[PDB]
Design a protein around this nucleic acid. Structure first.
Length: 960
DNA sequence: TTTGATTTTCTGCTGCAGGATGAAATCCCG
DNA sequence: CGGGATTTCATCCTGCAGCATCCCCGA
RNA sequence: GGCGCUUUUAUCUCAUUACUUUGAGAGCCAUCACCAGCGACUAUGUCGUAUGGGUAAAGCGCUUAUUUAUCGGAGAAACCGAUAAAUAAGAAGCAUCAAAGUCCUGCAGCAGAAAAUCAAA
């Protein structure tokens, strides 16, 4: 039996309970609002229910729509105002958003600055730096840099972060007094959206307090990103400046003329970023055109320059809402293309004989292109021209007329058909793509004749037409729908947002979420005896800051025109988790409601094959009781080898290191190897291939395939976490992850983001572990991953590039052929090497000795040491691939013993073995030696090998 | 015979940062 | 007066160390 | 690629709600040339292509009546008991079980896809 909540119940039972911390673990519940569509779906059941709930009233829906619209307008207005202010003065704004220290840090300041890092804007006076050194629990001291003015009204403790020349450190959302400047009537600011946008209809307090943090979070995040990147840009500039001289030196070494353009300094806007990147791109283009190709120079001798990447933007106001109509762009294309009839006509009708053959070169398709199921419209146009030439001879005056007429007919038919389809309700994706492609082909055929006469005019037309082509191709899949949100700061009587329910002597309670934001609405509260429940009365509870729970009664009327009433809909599992759980009771106070939102968003429906706006309610819950982890002590161990071909391979061993035959294979025999998450890559590749095949046809995949990959990946990671946690808890053990840097993954050519699932698995497993209050260091740990995939299990030797160099020097030719030895073990040089360097794309293999004999053609007596750098690079490469320990991803071969086994399993066992080693004593002795500056990793390799075969001799009896 | 640079556009998925407000004070206000 | 309705404000804490670890490559 | 069946529950020692998903579970249906795209050419078009937009499909059975032929009244003749099929209708158990869910706001980076510009292999 594998059920996650069963494991949670066992973990709860076998431990004690205690209260949570200041801010306990948090979890979010997402349900749906009762809409008449759900009612109709419920009424179509084969077994109709007896008590069908009532849907939302028409009165509340208009209130929700109006209030969400006003909310969006107000947020946009505030963002616009602050965008203008930032565009006026950056430094002032970023100095206005700083987060001061809590007003309890009044310990005696000891050393002031020995000074003008920043300045508070109220008095426009520079802030002076003050330091303080503290010793923590672990004894490591750190110094805090603070900013304080000389004016008593401005003597705050704004924190600073030093640099090796200072930075702010933290931007808070509640630092700025938003309410007193943009809501209250005393302020004379010209922008009062509640007074202006809202029409003086909504309550001031809650709406203003919500809008405050909603804007402040975004602006603080943007400013933090800007302050973080301002230093990385400086580092990139200083690094890239030196490289220019090296490129200049290499180009000048052959008398190359290099363009004279300078590098602008560090920009503080987005336009200077664009100019600097344009300069860098120009330099890179010149280098590629002149150095790498013509002079056959490698990239590492003349390394390329870098760009300035990652520059942020101010929220929501720099988004270019390129709202254009499809037919308008079509009309522009048709009007502009019709202008250039006569010039192209003259050009084609007044050409010579053999220049025509080279002119129509882009109009012939290769045989490889021809066979691939379909050819492009341009090539089809070229074939049409070829047919006209074969039909009518050399009379090229009339051929342009015939081509123009035929393309006119084709475009006219496409336009008529497209218009006719989208008249009623139909939308065709493929037809629009075909029309755009034919328009592009016609444009190219017309404009080819001006590519040399006037380049400036021709280039402007090129940019115009390519922008038009891109927009025409991308519009029929552009998404215009955007979310709409409604914050609710907190669930207390202050904010006037009720979550109420009723009682019948048991937890069976009817749900309702009530919002009172408009003026004139009535909604009261009444304090009651804790157990004075009455029939047909709605109840609720109000949490207290001190930790008391107040059973608090709510009374109101369902017919109030200024109220909003929301009934919810969910499942039994959700209710058992949050609403009426048995261990965590919001009635008692073990669970506390924090806040929530109201979300309307897109959703796919298979019945209509469309996306329709639907309402959602997100509620956040914070736990107030956690478990104790003082009574836990795992003994056994499991290693995990994360990857893409197999998302999870696990192996279990005892503390002694002996594998445990406690898992049943597909044949029912005991073993120590399991594979979780298999066959997932095939589903992902199927989804991706469907996306590609639909993208080739019409330029984009319909909304049916929009979110399949994310859902499948999330299911994989959640089930994998459940399985791993089950295997841990039921076997009395502890997991061992490999130490991998965050965001690790392969960035290549056939890579997709759905498969980068290492950090996601680790984070999810930590989250599900920490929800019960346990530290991640108890049921989880990470250790070194070095040499884990290079270590043999039978002989223990780890292959190193240093060994390759040693073995290569020994190799020579004998009567039997080329031979070599390793540690007294003779090797035979007779093999074949397979590989796949795209391009030709066919199975090609190479002989080993013959190529080595062929390599011996350019040398006498096969003196390998005398070979040049270029030909020696081939020499070790051939031996590296033929003697590789991983010729195939799932198959491993050893060199010193020739062992054959699955690759991941051995590495998985080596993970646990390494985790055991790192807490052994041989590691300590290595630490003592290396402290003297001997940063020789080969000593670590030697220590690894020595410790490994020391242990293998007695406890690790090899499998036979 | 595809390729490595650059340009145009559309998409989705991940990796960062922010945060998950109630208490106390006035000011009314019929 | 009592009960809303708008108005400020401020807030506890300090993972424990070595260079690959899932990558894959011409006639 | 779709069509009717929905469970299991992760709380067996105790209860609610329908939500968003994942898939491993039987049975059945994917035909038109109305419009477009495409390939080959007798070529300002003709044929095939079902590649897209539309248009019919998608469960057992009994019960009820009708229609074709048969065993039934030898008769084959109404009326049906049944035999095989088709038409129409309503109850009918539904042929279907097994697991998960922390949100949102804003940015940036990657890869997917066609198209445009230079040179070399």
């Amino acid at each position: 039996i594998k059920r996650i909540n069963k494991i949670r119940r066992r973990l709860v039972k076998d431990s004690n309970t205690k209260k949570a911390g200041k801010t306990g673990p948090m979890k979010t519940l997402l349900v749906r609002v009762m809409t008449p569509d759900l009612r109709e779906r419920l009424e179509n059941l084969r077994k109709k229910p007896e008590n069908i709930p009532q849907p939302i009233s028409n009165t509340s829906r208009a209130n929700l729509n109006k209030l969400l619209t006003d909310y969006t307008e107000m947020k946009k207005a505030i963002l616009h105002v602050y965008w203008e202010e930032f565009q006026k003065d950056p430094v002032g704004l970023m100095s206005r958003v700083a987060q001061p220290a809590p007003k309890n840090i009044d310990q005696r300041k000891l050393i002031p600055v020995k000074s003008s890092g920043f300045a508070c804007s109220q008095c426009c006076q520079p802030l002076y730096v003050y330091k303080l050194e503290q010793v923590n629990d672990k004894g490591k001291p750190h110094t805090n840099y603070f900013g304080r003015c000389n004016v008593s009204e401005h003597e705050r403790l704004i924190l600073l972060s030093p640099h090796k020349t200072y930075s702010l450190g933290k931007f808070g959302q509640r630092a700025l007094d938003f309410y007193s400047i943009h809501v209250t009537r005393e302020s004379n600011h010209p922008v009062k959206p509640l007074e202006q946008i809202g029409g003086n209809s909504c309550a001031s307090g809650p709406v203003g307090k919500a809008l405050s943090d909603a804007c402040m979070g975004a602006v603080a995040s943007f400013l933090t990103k800007y302050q973080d990147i301002i230093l990385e840009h400086q580092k990139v500039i200083k690094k890239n400046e030196k490289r220019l001289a090296n490129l200049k030196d290499i180009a000048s070494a052959n008398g190359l003329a290099f363009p004279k353009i300078t590098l602008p300094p560090q920009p503080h806007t987005k336009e200077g970023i664009e100019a600097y990147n344009n300069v860098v791109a120009q330099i890179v283009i010149w280098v590629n055109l002149n150095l790498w190709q013509k002079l056959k120079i490698g990239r590492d001798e003349a390394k390329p320059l870098q760009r300035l990447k990652g520059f942020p933007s101010f929220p929501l106001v720099e988004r270019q809402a390129n709202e254009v109509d499809w037919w308008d762009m079509v009309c522009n294309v048709k009007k502009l293309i019709n202008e250039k009839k006569e010039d192209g006509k003259v050009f084609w009708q007044n050409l010579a004989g053999y220049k025509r053959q080279e002119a129509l070169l882009p109009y012939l398709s290769s045989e490889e292109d021809r066979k691939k199921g379909k050819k492009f419209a341009r090539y089809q146009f070229g074939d049409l021209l070829l047919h006209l030439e074969k039909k009518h001879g050399e009379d090229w005056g009339k051929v342009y007329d015939e081509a123009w007429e035929r393309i006119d007919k084709k475009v006219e038919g496409l336009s008529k058909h497209i218009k006719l389809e989208e008249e009623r309700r139909s939308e065709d994706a493929q037809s629009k793509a075909a029309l755009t492609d034919w328009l592009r082909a016609k444009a190219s055929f017309v404009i080819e004749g001006l590519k040399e006469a006037d380049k400036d005019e021709f280039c402007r037309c090129e940019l115009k037409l390519q922008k038009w082509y891109g927009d025409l191709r991308g519009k029929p899949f552009a998404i215009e729908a955007e979310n709409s949100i409604l914050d609710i700061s907190g669930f207390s009587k202050q904010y006037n947002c009720a979550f109420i329910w009723q009682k019948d002597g048991v937890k069976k309670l009817n749900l309702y979420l009530i919002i009172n934001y408009f003026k004139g609405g009535k909604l009261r509260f009444k304090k009651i005896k804790p157990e004075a429940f009455e029939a047909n009365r709605f109840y609720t509870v109000i949490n207290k800051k001190s930790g008391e729970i107040v059973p608090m009664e709510v009374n109101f009327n369902f017919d109030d025109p200024n109220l909003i009433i929301l009934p919810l809909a969910f499942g039994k599992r959700q209710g058992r988790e949050f609403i009426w759980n048995d261990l965590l009771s919001l009635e008692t106070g073990s669970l506390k409601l924090a806040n929530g939102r109201v979300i309307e968003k897109t959703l796919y429906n298979r019945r209509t094959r469309q996306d329709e706006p639907a309402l959602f309610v997100a509620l956040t819950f914070e736990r107030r009781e956690v478990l104790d982890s003082s009574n836990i002590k795992p003994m056994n161990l499991i290693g995990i080898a994360r990857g893409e071909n197999i998302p999870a391979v696990i192996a279990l061993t005892d503390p002694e290191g002996c594998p445990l035959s406690r898992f049943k294979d597909s044949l029912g025999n005991p073993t120590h190897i399991l594979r979780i998450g298999e066959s997932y890559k095939e589903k992902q590749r199927t989804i991706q291939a469907a996306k590609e095949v639909e993208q080739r046809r019409a330029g984009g995949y319909s909304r049916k395939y929009a979110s399949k990959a994310k859902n499948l990946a999330d299911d994989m990671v959640r089930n994998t976490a459940r399985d791993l946690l089950y295997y841990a808890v039921t076997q009395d053990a502890m997991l061992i992850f490999a130490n991998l840097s965050r965001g690790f993954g392969r960035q290549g050519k056939r890579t997709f983001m759905a498969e980068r699932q290492y950090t996601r698995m680790e984070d999810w497993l930590t989250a599900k572990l920490a929800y019960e209050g346990l530290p991640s260091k108890t049921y989880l740990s990470k250790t070194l991953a070095q040499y884990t995939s290079k270590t043999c299990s039978n002989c223990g030797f780890t292959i190193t590039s240093a060994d390759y160099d040693r073995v290569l020097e020994k190799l020579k030719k004998t009567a039997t052929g080329w031979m070599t030895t390793i540690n007294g073990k003779e090797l035979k040089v007779e093999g074949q090497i397979t590989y796949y360097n795209r391009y030709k794309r066919q199975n090609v293999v190479k002989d080993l000795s013959v190529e080595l004999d062929r390599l011996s053609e350019e040398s006498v007596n096969n003196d390998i040491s005398s070979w040049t750098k270029g030909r020696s690079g081939e020499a070790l490469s051939l031996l590296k691939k033929r003697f590789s320990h991983r010729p195939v991803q799932e198959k491993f071969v050893c060199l010193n013993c020739g062992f054959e086994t699955h690759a991941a399993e051995q590495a998985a066992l080596n993970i646990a073995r390494s985790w055991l080693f790192l807490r052994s004593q041989e590691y300590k002795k290595y630490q003592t030696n290396k402290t003297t500056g001997n940063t020789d990793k080969r000593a670590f390799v030697e220590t690894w090998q020595s410790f490994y075969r020391k242990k293998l001799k007695e406890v690790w009896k090899p499998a036979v």
